[PDB]
């Protein structure tokens, strides 16, 4: 599986300073596979460490007699359910690297993974609107030819995931891929028109989790509401649920962050961690204004929030209303995650979003030429380092435009850096929305509008919102009359995601050449 891999140089002195330990991931859950503590709670369901490690090998097992080898690819669509976790760790000690495609993606998403990766195996879920029929599977399993082996939850027919998870391994070793080859696949927030993939190595992949783990002080006592769509890195690796069975705790999996799900299940299962969004977050506090029993959240000792800009009006409004400490998480799928400290100062947890998790992760700031700037100006995140990727997936193109000439990766962030080392989030260059933490490639939308027989021109632009930070709005230059819904169902047709729809719909009579940066102002 080709990756751009690191100068030697440098994969030796990542190893000689103890961050590659050249260890699987599946090493993460082994480690625990004697053990009978819980690691994940799914509803009324509860899985211990020995099962989630039987459960693993007896998947792992029953795809290889299915015939699905070591170095071939995975679509995975599963979504805040036990079977995520299995089915990566399955994959992982088969040497088979997945995409985890989040609930919300649709066939446009699926298919452009799938194109990307020409997965042997498909592992998706009958409750997903695509998958309750077989007319899609009939038709994605034709134009991707290479699947194989499809695996199907909450399916009693012949290609049913419980099954497989529920018979015994007979003789089963497992063969993880090389630490320093490829694990798995992360997927990128979106700055172009298709969906570029994040090559992950054990090695890399690891020591992000291993060095979370140390930063937020999880073990055994560590119970983590995963509420959050939990195939995300933030859900997964910052620490996430990764981190939480390293440290050998407990995951708490609910299937949205809404407060009348997640308030019940953090005082019934007595969560003392869990990540949020912004928008999350405020609906949280609103809903404790609105009359919920703060003391639902008592066991609650840290709450992270991350994925966009936490405002300090509602960083400072935690402490007080909720009662735990803030952890200010800013990351991304590439690599590069900079948290808040356990032990920072009010001031740095409220106004900052931290430094880099890694003493040798590296961050100066770009002029538009790409020059240093000095210390407090603002300008582009430029970042490498051990867990920090070197090339998204077979995207030569791409690549090119994306890392400068010594393997320095652009986030297309613009940030400011203080007297302290700390880094603040101050705007953005690249052409993405982020609706309440979730990504959009502004490109990938226009694309598909400019399909519409009535749509000349499109301009897919961030707007101002309390709640959710951006909310999308399409400018459009039309032959005829269109209407928002007219737009939003034609979209929805081309089989898109929700949070990808335009919050807002208006036709204009011109559009500047499209020059954003002017229909901005
Ligand atoms: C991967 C990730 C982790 Cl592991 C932890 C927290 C957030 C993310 C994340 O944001 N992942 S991402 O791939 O979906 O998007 C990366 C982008 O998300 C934005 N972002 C993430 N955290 C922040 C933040 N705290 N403040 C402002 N922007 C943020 C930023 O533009 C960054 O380039």
Redesign the pocket.
């Given at each position: 599986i080709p990756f751009t891999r690191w100068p030697e140089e440098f994969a030796r002195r990542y190893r000689e300073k103890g961050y590659w330990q050249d260890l699987p991931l599946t090493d993460i859950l082994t480690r625990h596979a004697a053990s009978d503590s819980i690691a994940v709670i799914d509803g009324e369901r509860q899985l211990s460490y020995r099962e989630l490690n039987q459960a693993a090998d007896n998947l792992a097992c029953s795809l290889r007699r299915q015939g699905i080898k070591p170095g071939e690819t995975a679509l995975v669509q599963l979504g805040n359910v036990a079977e995520l976790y299995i089915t990566f760790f399955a994959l992982l000690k088969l040497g088979v690297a997945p995409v985890l495609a989040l609930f919300s993606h649709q066939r446009s998403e699926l298919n452009a993974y799938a194109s990307q990766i020409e997965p042997a195996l498909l592992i998706a879920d009958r409750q997903h609107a695509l998958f309750s029929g077989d007319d899609f599977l009939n038709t994605f399993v034709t134009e991707h030819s290479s699947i194989r082996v499809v695996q199907l939850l909450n399916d009693s027919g012949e290609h049913n995931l419980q099954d497989a998870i529920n018979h015994p391994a007979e003789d089963f070793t497992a063969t993880p891929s090389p630490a320093d080859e490829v694990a798995y696949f992360?997927?990128?927030?979106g700055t172009t028109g298709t969906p570029k993939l994040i090559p992950r190595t054990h090695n890399d992949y690891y020591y992000?989790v291993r060095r979370?783990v140390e930063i937020c002080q999880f073990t055994q006592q560590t119970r983590y509401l995963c509420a959050i769509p939990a195939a995300?890195?933030?859900?997964?690796?910052?620490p996430?649920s990764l981190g939480v069975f390293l440290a050998g705790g407990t995951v708490v999996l609910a299937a949205d962050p809404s407060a009348t799900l997640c308030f019940p299940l953090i005082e019934k299962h007595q969560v003392n961690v869990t990540?949020l969004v912004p928008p999350a977050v405020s609906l949280w506090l609103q809903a404790l204004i609105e009359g919920e029993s703060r003391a639902q959240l008592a066991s609650l000792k840290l709450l992270?929030?991350?994925?966009?800009?936490?405002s300090a009006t509602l960083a400072a409004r935690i402490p007080a209303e909720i009662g735990c400490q803030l952890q200010?998480?800013?990351?991304?799928?590439?690599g590069l995650?900079?948290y808040t400290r356990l032990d920072d100062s009010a001031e740095k947890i409220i106004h900052t979003?931290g430094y880099p998790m890694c003493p040798d992760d590296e961050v100066w700031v770009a002029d538009a030429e790409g020059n240093p700037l000095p210390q407090g100006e603002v300008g582009r995140?430029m970042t490498r380092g051990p867990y920090t990727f070197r090339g998204y997936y077979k995207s030569p193109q791409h690549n090119a435009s994306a890392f400068d000439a010594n393997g320095f990766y652009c986030?297309?962030?613009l940030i400011s850096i203080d007297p302290e080392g700390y880094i603040t989030?101050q705007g953005?260059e690249?052409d993405?929305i982020?609706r309440g933490?979730?990504?959009i490639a502004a490109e990938e939308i226009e694309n598909l509008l400019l399909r519409h027989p009535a749509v000349i021109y499109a301009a897919l632009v961030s707007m101002e919102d309390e709640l959710m930070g951006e909310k999308s709005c399409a400018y459009l230059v039309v032959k005829e009359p269109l209407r928002a819904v007219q737009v939003r169902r034609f979209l929805r047709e081309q089989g898109i995601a929700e949070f990808k729809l335009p919050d807002r719909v208006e036709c204009v009579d011109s559009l500047p050449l499209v020059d954003k940066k002017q229909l901005r102002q």
């Open positions: 992360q997927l990128s927030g992000s979370s995300h890195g933030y859900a997964m690796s910052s996430g990540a992270q929030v991350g994925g966009a800009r936490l200010q998480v800013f990351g991304m799928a590439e995650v900079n979003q995140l986030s297309g962030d989030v953005r690249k993405q982020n933490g979730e990504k």
